[PDB]
Every structure is written in C-alpha cells, then in structure tokens.
Amino acid sequence: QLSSKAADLFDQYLVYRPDWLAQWETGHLVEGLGEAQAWQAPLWKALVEYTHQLGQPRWHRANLYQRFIETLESATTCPPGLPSRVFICGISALPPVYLQALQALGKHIEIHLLFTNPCRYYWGDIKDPAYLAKLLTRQRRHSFEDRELPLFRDSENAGQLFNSDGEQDVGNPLLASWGKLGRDYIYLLSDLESSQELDAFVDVTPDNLLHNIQSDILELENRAVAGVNIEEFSRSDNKRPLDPLDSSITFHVCHSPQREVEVLHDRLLAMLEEDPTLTPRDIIVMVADIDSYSPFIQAVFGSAPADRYLPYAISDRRARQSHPVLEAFISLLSLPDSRFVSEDVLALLDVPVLAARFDITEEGLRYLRQWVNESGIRWGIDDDNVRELELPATGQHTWRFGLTRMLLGYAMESAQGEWQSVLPYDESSGLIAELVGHLASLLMQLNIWRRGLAQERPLEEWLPVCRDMLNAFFLPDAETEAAMTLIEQQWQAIIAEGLGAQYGDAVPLSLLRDELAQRLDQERISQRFLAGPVNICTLMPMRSIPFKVVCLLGMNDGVYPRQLAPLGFDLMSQKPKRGDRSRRDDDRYLFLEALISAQQKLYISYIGRSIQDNSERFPSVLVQELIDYIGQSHYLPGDEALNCDESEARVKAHLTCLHTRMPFDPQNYQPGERQSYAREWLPAASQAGKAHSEFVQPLPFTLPETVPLETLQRFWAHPVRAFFQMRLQVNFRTEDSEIPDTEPFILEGLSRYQINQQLLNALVEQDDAERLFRRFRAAGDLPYGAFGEIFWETQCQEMQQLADRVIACRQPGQSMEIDLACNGVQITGWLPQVQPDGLLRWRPSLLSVAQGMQLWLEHLVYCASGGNGESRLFLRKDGEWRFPPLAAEQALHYLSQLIEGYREGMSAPLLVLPESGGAWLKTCYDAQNDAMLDDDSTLQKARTKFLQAYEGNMMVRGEGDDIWYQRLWRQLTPETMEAIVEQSQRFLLPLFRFNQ
C-alpha cells in the first residue's frame, strides 16, 4: 500500500510539478516546502538510479518536455510526421506544462482549442500590476470587431482587482463560489503569448427563471438585493418579477430514494406531455452515486406499465457480467485461509459451472443439502485442517468425517453398528450414492489445491496458477468464456507488469488476490450512454453535453460534493498553485456546468426528512446557495411592496414543494399541478373497495360411515390445524431450518427429545445403555468427551427414574383390532401393545392436555370394545394420566360426543385450545363437589392463567405464537375468548372429571 501510494504521488508529480523532480534528480532539496521531502527526495533519486541500472530507457515526462520545447522553438515549419491540425474540444482543465507544450507546438501545427467559459468578460485572477497591463489585449470576434472586459480603465482602477488576490468584485456569487477551476483555466489561457483568441458568445433572452440566472452568469453581474439602506430594504419592486406559472427551476423535497425516483418519473411524464416535440433522448438524470440508486431506477422504470413506459439506460454502473463465477474464483483464491464452513462450500457448489464440471445436477444439490444438514458436517475439511488452526483434533464434524459416514452407510446398514467409531448414515444407499463420489472428488481437489497454494513463489511460478484453477475447477460454457478470458487477462496483466519491472523476491498469494479484486471493479460501462433512452448517469468531470432537461438527484449534505481527503503526506496539499486539481473544486465546477448546460428546464431534488425517525436532513450547501440567490433576486408579482426578507421567504416556499411520505396519500391525486400519473394506486387513495371478510364460514360437510381411528388421533392432536390441513387441504409448511454453525456443545429441543425417546425405549427393555451411548458417540450427536459423558449420565439418571416406574407397572401384551359402530359410524384401525390390565403408554415430556386427550380417546375406544382394564400414562417430572374402567354405554356416549365434535370441527374451525383451555378448566373446576365454580376471584385467577398459558414468557413460547391461530385472529378479542372457553369447557370436562 505504501509503494502504490508513493507511485501514484510520483506520477502526479511528473504531470504537474517537474521542477521538484529535476531538483531531486540532482540531490538538493527545495526551500520553503513542507514535511516528507526528507524521505521523498532520496526515494526519487534512488528510483532514477535503479531504473538506470535496470537498463530501461532513462527518458520520462519530467525531463522530456523542456527538450521538446527547445527543439520545436527553433526549427523548420514542418518536421516530419506531424498532423495537419488537432482539436481540443471540451476540456476545461489542463496543466501549465501541457499548455506550454501546446503553445510551443502551435507555431508548426494549427491547433484549434475549444473552451466554454460561462462568463463573457474576463473573470479571472491577476498576478501583478505589471501583468494587468498585459491584459490590455483583445479577443477578436469571428466577423465584426474587438472587445474585452467593460469600462476597462476605471474597472482596473476600482476595487475589481484586489492587491494580490483574484477579482473580488466579479458580482455573481454563484460564479464566484463555483468557478474555481474555470478561473485557473482562464488565467492560464490569457497568460499565453502566441495564442490568438476569438469568441462566439451567443446571448440568452431573459424571460424564464433559468434564463434569468444564465444571463446573469453570462453578462457577469449581480442582481441580488441586500438592502444596505432602509429606503431600499423596505421597498421590494426592484427585483425581477417571476411568473407563478413558470417552472424552469424547481426543487423537490422528498423522503426516501424510492419515493424520489417515483416523483421524478411522474415529473418527466408531465414534461413530455406538456412539450410535444420532446423526446426521451434529450433528458438526463444525474446521480451522486449510481450504485446506491440503480435498484430503485430499475424497479420503478420497470414497474411502469406498457402504456406509460419510457426507456432508460443506466450508464456508468459497474459491470457484473458473470458475478457468481467471479465470486467463485475470488473465494477459491481465498482457499488457504478458509475454515470450510459447510454453508460456504454449498454456496460454492451453487455455481452451475463448477457443478457441471464435477457433474452434480440440480436434482443432486437438494439431496446433498439435506445430507450435509443431517449428517453433521460443520467444520474444516480434514483433521489436518483442524490441527492447522492450532485446536484440539477431535476428528468428528469434519467434511472427511461426513464423507466417511456417507460411504460407510452405503456399504453398511445403520442398525448393525459402528466400525471405526463412525456410525453409518442410513440414507445414501442406492443409485443416488454416486453424488457422494462426485462430492468426494470435489473435496479431494479442494484439499490438494489448498495444500498447493500455500507457499510463496516468485511471479514466474505464479503465472500458470490461474490457468490451472480455471481448467481444473470449471467447465467452460458459451456464457462463461467471456468471464474466464477476462480473469486470465487481468491476472496475466498484473504478473506482466510485475515481471517487466524485474521483481525477484517471494510474493504471497493474498497480495495478488487483493490486487485482482481491487482491479476487477475499476471497469465501468457506458456503451449505452446517449443511445436514445433517458440517460441515467453519475456526475463525471469534463463531460458537458448540452441537454434539454437536467435532473439532479440526491443532493443531501455530505453526499455531494463527494469527499476525497488528500493523503496527508502529499506535497501538493501544503503549497498549491494555479492549475492544480482537487475533487471538491471539481464537484463544485460540475454543479456550475450542470446549471449552465441545462437549456430548457432544471430539476433539483434532495432527501428532506428521513423516513424512519421523521428527523430533518438538510440539502447540500450548493443547493442552499442557489435557493438563497433565487430568493434574494426575485419576487412574486402579488406582494409588490412587502419586504426583502418576506419576498425571499415567499418565493422560497413557492419554489420548493414537499412530497407525500407514502404514495397512496390523496394529496398526490388532488387536482392541480402536482397530480401523479400512477393510476394503479387510485382505488387505494380514494378508498373504493371492501375490507377483508372473516375466515370463519359455515362449510357444507357430510360425515362418512367409515372413520379410521388415526383420523381421530390426527384430528384431536390439534383441532384448528386439523381443520386447516384436513378439510380444505392447506398446510403452511415452513422452510427447513438452516445448517448450524458449530458442533453441538449442548443439546436442546428436538435434538435431545429424540435422544431421550430412544434412551427410554431402550431402558424400559432393561438393556445396557452403553451400546446405545457408543452408537450416539459414533453418530457425532452428543457433545465432545467428558461433557458428552456428563450429559449422558444425567439423562440416564432421569430416564432411569422414569423407567423404574414404567417397569413397576408393566405386563407384556400384544396388539388388538378395533371395529365399533358409534352413532351408525364405523371406526376402523388398530391399537398397539394393549396388555391385560389395559393400555400403557410412556412418553418423555411434560404434562400436556393434548396428550391427555390422546390417551382419553385411545382409552374410550378400548373401553367401548370390551376390555375391563385401566389406562395409564407416564411422563417426566412424575406426571401421570390414569383413567378408571367404565361401562360400555358410558364409553359409547363419550365417544359419540367426540365424533360429534369431529364432524362439527371439520365444518367450522372448532375452538378447542388444549393447553390454555385446559389450564382455565383446571383453575375453575373443583374436584370436591365436582361442579363448575362461579366466584369472581377464581374467574379472575382463571382469566390471568389463561392469558399466561396463551402467551408465554419471554423465553418460553406460548400457544398464541402459532400460524394456525395467527391466520384466524391476531389479537385475542374477549368475545372470541368467551367462545373458546365455552367450547373448551364443553369438550375437556371428561378429562378433568375422570383424571385420578
């Protein structure tokens, strides 16, 4: 970075100040200069000595120009090879060395130089009083006569010219504040000796506001009223009148850039509608930075329909022809520092070029995604890559571990067991397994190249690495050849300059990769600049094309002028001179030339108030000064004699128009002038359509005669969800959860629920848990080592406590068949593992009313089908659900109630909330008198218990946060609360009546 900055500074020295280089080539310093000379002069002298020692030619632009000027100052008229004439059109900044060279060459070739100064008279600075008499020369008109700055005797005599400084009395504050580059250029042009200068200054008739401003700039005057004396300050009829229907210059305060471009589009359509022979070629829209405005441009200009479409062409935007393979190659150069996160490697396989090279198709990408998600692949590619980061080599959760798991699962079956402490993966088993072979080929290539790209080699050995990367990882298609050739060209050019400059030492890869990435975004595109559409572009120096409508967008404070602070140790920032160029003066002069080049109408727009916090964000200083000048030199025709300040405030409020925050505001569509063309939002603004009807509708449903028991189980697991995905067959199936970042340190949720379920089902069978613990350890599911052992032993201690109680009340049993006839509706299905004492189920969870419902239904079916026995359930924290044996008539009556609830709930979203309604019913219903209570204190306790069960705490999720309820209602209204508690009381009271 130091060498690049120093080389840029030295090139700038070469162009701009050759005297310093001529001095430093000898070895002396320069007096009166800032710091950093003490290390910059020996650097330059050593560079000259080194480039002489390399045998490269000594000649350069610092010591060449003097010899060139001396050669052409005294010779024949035509030394051979010279052109007949050469034009310099539209450049308003040239170095003094270049101008000296041009006047030296001008005696031999006729050189036509074309320059657009906005002023007419002489508006430059002055060097010395002995130089002012030299400015008694004169421009010659093309046909008529000669003229210069007006009243040239007493103007030089008066305070127009300062003691040493520039023309302080130019008049026009716009010109004085902005033309900093133009003043230096005109001072350089009038300083030439042999130049023969001529003018062609076409006048502008002051009728419009814009033409008033342009004429004031041209004739170099100042019509702004300040009001030194009170008889001037009171009266206000001396400024020019402004037509209230005149819209040459307008300002548009907006809110957000999307709203800003939406306003601009409508105004351009209005301008095209008003002026008949205006075409979308002649309209330019100039943006402070195009990369942060282009998406909104594309969005609204594409969202315009066919009847209201005017074509756009976003020039000066950075090109991205094959962005995915560009990023793939940059990330592939970033290989040796990568930790190989599985998400990033799958984003690498998202590349179609590389997938086709390693023959994995889009069908196979989904299966690899699911297999990486489930198989436990998170970390570095090998064990060696884990050790290379100086970490403990655990072996598990690596890419090699996952691929070993996949291959071992192809050769194995998962029920057999581990082989080398790797539990095989049961999914990859058939013809789909060759995707694993292709993935392992990918990993072998990536591992070999991350080994190979590590060392530091000279540039001659860095030459073929890019070709090796491209032809080893990518399969060239018809689309990809452009990007691949461009990448090879840029890499070759970098190493070509490095080799031609005779560099010998070692070069690490990160340097070359950073240089390639920094060069790959320096190539803009502007092929479709003025090809016919509306020309969207960013503001660029020395590009002054006269258009009809100039629109400037995004002129907030700080955004424009675009800031570029100098390097600090630059030696032009300390002691500047005349022709020096800096970015602030550059951007100010571009604003001035944008004002001049607009021929018909102007459009300045800036963000007024931030849309988030509704704060205030000010316009740029340039727009503020323009508005101040307009207000200080105009007045509305009504208030002929009000005040200077009152007239200024009136015209400032008249010109600037605010804009609505959101497009469907009827202030947009109210008639007049600020009337949008967006017919799409007109019903939204005028409120011409009905609101949303309630989702609960009475649906026609007829109950069949054969209802399988799994239908009732799936229904009573969750009734509203069963209505959604069973009646009208909508299921809001959410996406898959993404790949976790790291290996499991702790296990929560489903990942431990499955472990507890398998452990409990093994422990009830009185089997040793060591085999299953080894199975999980080889699975890469438990935490590492001692932490895994601790977690396993505490889970063993809890499931042993549960399984003791399960064993103490268990008799071996078998299945049975179910076939009843309840209300004339047959029930089919099976019941698993019913024992002579009845139904036993064990489940590692907390006490849930939905599971109580499940056991109650499964037990009513059994008790209606004979079966004198009890039904028990065993849960965590010594939860329990016991039901006594009943009579057949009672069981059929209760099952009739459940089937009737099913047939109602398939037709309407039956409102049985199992957890919340269960908690409310448990609070209210008393098991002493077996009656429903009514006292207001217990009703209020049940109310707050129901709310605490509906919405949970901040770190538990209540039953409210579910899409099946959010689809029906958002905020729980008390009337629906009364309805749901009535339905839940109707349907859940057998459970709390018979729970013992």
């Binding site: 569509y669 009337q675 063309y677």
Partner: peptide, 25 residues
C-alpha cells in the same frame, strides 16, 4: 374529496436505437 389521476394521451417515447448490426442480422 373528489380526485382522479391524469392520463398521458400521446405516446411517451419514439422508436429510436443505435444498432450494431444486431437487429439487421
């Protein structure tokens, strides 16, 4: 209020291009 959106009646743009022997070919 009573409100409506103005309608552009003429065609907004012409048919102009700079072709590079693509439309002809």
């Amino acid at each position: 209020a009573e409100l409506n959106a103005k309608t552009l009646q003429r065609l907004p743009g012409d048919n102009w291009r700079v072709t590079s022997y693509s439309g002809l070919q």
